[PDB]
From a paper:
NanoString gene expression analysis was applied to tumors from mice treated with the [name] inhibitor [name] to identify key pathways involved in the anti‐tumor response. We showed that [name] inhibitors increased the secretion of T‐cell‐recruitment chemokines in a cyclic GMP‐AMP synthase (cGAS)/stimulator of interferon genes protein ([name])‐dependent manner in cancer cells. Both pharmacological and small interfering RNA (siRNA)‐mediated [name] inhibition increased cGAS/[name]‐mediated expression and secretion of CCL5 and CXCL10. The combination of [name] inhibitor and [name] agonist further induced cytokine release in both human and murine cancer cells as well as monocytic or dendritic innate immune cells. We propose that pharmacological [name] inhibition may synergize with emerging therapies targeting the cGAS/[name] pathway.
Residue numbers in the entry: 280 to 417, 472 to 871
Write the structure that this text describes.
């Protein structure tokens, strides 16, 4: 009767709690709201979604409140994976809470865990550094949990190795935050130590990590020699090919099967010497074809003297977004090509056969001419195969929405690529979150050429495009908590456009969701965006 156990909100209080619980994870609760959540804490234990709000209400400095908070945490209806990500941010230091996050995160399968791993490696920054160190030879934390899943899953192990090694080689971290640099060095050692206690298969997996590392080391050596060559591009290409061709010297053309770092499920036995060339751009990245196990080939870009990490983040988010859309039965024919940094200054990208829209205009005059040339169909829309046009409309819609949310700038027509199957996709994420090389970038990154490709503002393709934009936008809004919680874990990352304003990064994504609007209003807003953009184009 003086107890809180049985307090029961009326209809009006329930409606106010439902508002508070439905807030996005970034919304700061007022003192009034905090008091209200606390008051009906026992009532809220039936709501998994109320737990993150509850934990934001605890005065941790009051021993009384802290103990009861942890009692309730144990009794709460269990938190979902997407929400556990919030507990791994810099806001939470409480050991029990952080371990609870891991306990709930463990419920994810390996497929989902891989979609979040990049962020989870950043989140080690917010863990107990002493505990990580003390686990070295003289209820899991995050470090123990990741290593434990990696020991049992060679894909996870592969990405854990590379994500952590890049952190280990970050000279910015080393100079600016030596304790954090030291922590990542300890994670690597903890991972090695764990692998060495494993069975024979795990010890072999470990040795194949090492074999990848030395393969990349040798590729770095090769690129230094090529980039230092005095002569023209043809001479550099000859030197690139000769060095690749000399397996005795460089051990790059024929090696024992190792996982491709970029895609570890694909095993490779070296690089084809004679088809390796440099791109005609200032930093001289190479196009390399890998020899795959089944006798096939896998083209990549290997960049040296260039930081891929912003592109790595964005392609990892695009991958996530595509997966979420597919989860809701929407396949918009996207191209989330792989990107993996092997250091702060080099890395791999998956090369997709394609043509820049600039070159399409130059060689064929328009996107539609391109399609009519390569996919003619007498009775298809504007003489184009229906499947191809369908793929074009879908992929256009998908990228329209995704680049809008991510604030992707520098959208010149060499950064929009097209395939002959009709896929359009974006590359080159050097400007994100509203940045652009020229002033006043538009909210939506649509161009005349793209609209004309689908037959103009008077076609049914155009209507299908707008519809697909609406649908994609509503689906991605439904995953706003997940997406925002993932960006929250990136705030301290050495990624240029985040590091400009760490504290405003998440807001810049969140605003694009227009969470303040209902689904009906959201559709209207998106319609209005597309109309305004396209109107301004003509
Ligand atoms: C890898 C992805 C997907 O497959 C197609 C090419 N793509 C590109 C992505 C990217 O960010 N930049 C690219 N270009 C190519 C034009 C010259 C500059 C630059 C690079 F890498 F060569 F330096 C290409």
């Amino acid at each position: 009767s003086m107890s809180d156990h049985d307090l029961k909100p009326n209809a009006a209080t329930r409606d106010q709690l439902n508002i508070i619980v439905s807030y996005p994870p970034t919304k700061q609760l007022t003192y009034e709201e905090q008091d209200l959540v606390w008051k009906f804490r026992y009532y809220l234990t039936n709501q998994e979604k109320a737990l993150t709000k509850f934990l934001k209400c605890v005065n941790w400095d009051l021993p009384q409140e802290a103990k009861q908070a942890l009692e309730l945490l144990g009794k709460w209806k269990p938190m979902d994976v997407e929400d556990s990500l919030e507990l791994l941010s810099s806001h939470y230091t409480n050991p029990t809470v952080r371990r609870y996050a891991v306990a709930r995160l463990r419920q994810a399968d390996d497929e989902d865990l891989l979609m979040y791993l990049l962020q989870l490696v950043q989140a080690l920054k917010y863990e107990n550094f002493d505990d990580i160190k003390n686990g070295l030879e003289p209820e899991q934390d995050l470090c123990t949990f990741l290593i434990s899943r990696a020991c049992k899953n060679s894909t996870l192990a592969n990405y854990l190795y590379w994500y952590v090694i890049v952190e280990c080689e970050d000279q910015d971290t080393q100079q600016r935050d030596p304790k954090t640099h030291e922590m990542y060095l300890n994670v690597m050692r903890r991972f090695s130590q764990a692998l060495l206690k494993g069975d024979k298969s795990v010890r072999v997996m470990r040795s194949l990590l090492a074999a990848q590392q030395t393969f990349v080391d040798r590729l770095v050596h090769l690129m230094k020699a090529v980039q230092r060559e005095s002569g023209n591009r043809k001479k550099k290409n000859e030197r690139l090919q000769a060095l690749l061709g000399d397996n005795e010297k460089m051990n790059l053309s024929d090696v024992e099967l190792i996982p491709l770092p970029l895609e570890p499920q694909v095993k490779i036995r070296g690089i084809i010497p004679e088809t390796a060339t440099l791109f005609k751009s200032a930093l001289m990245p190479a196009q390399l074809f890998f020899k795959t196990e089944d006798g096939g080939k896998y083209p990549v870009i290997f960049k040296h003297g260039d930081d891929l990490r912003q592109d790595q983040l964005i392609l990892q988010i695009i991958s996530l977004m595509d997966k979420l859309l597919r989860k809701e039965n929407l396949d918009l024919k996207l191209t989330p090509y792989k990107v993996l940094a092997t250091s702060t200054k080099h890395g791999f990208m998956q090369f997709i056969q394609s043509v820049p829209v600039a070159e399409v205009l130059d060689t064929e005059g328009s996107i539609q001419n391109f399609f009519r040339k390569y996919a003619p169909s007498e009775n298809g829309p504007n003489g184009i195969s229906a499947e191809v046009m369908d793929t074009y409309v879908k992929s256009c819609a998908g990228y329209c929405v995704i680049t809008y949310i991510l604030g992707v700038g520098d959208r010149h027509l060499d950064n929009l690529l097209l395939t002959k199957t009709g896929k359009l996709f974006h590359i080159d994420f050097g400007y994100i979150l509203g940045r652009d090389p020229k002033p006043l970038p538009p909210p939506m990154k649509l161009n005349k050429e793209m609209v004309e490709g689908m037959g103009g503002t008077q076609s049914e393709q155009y209507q299908e495009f707008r519809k697909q934009c609406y649908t994609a936008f509503l689906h991605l809004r439904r995953y706003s908590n997940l997406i925002l919680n993932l960006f929250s874990l990136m705030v301290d990352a050495n990624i240029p456009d985040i590091a400009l304003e760490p504290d405003k990064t998440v807001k810049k994504v969140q605003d694009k969701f227009r969470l303040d609007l209902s689904d009906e209003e959201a559709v209207h807003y998106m319609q209005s965006l597309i109309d305004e953009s396209v109107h301004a184009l003509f």
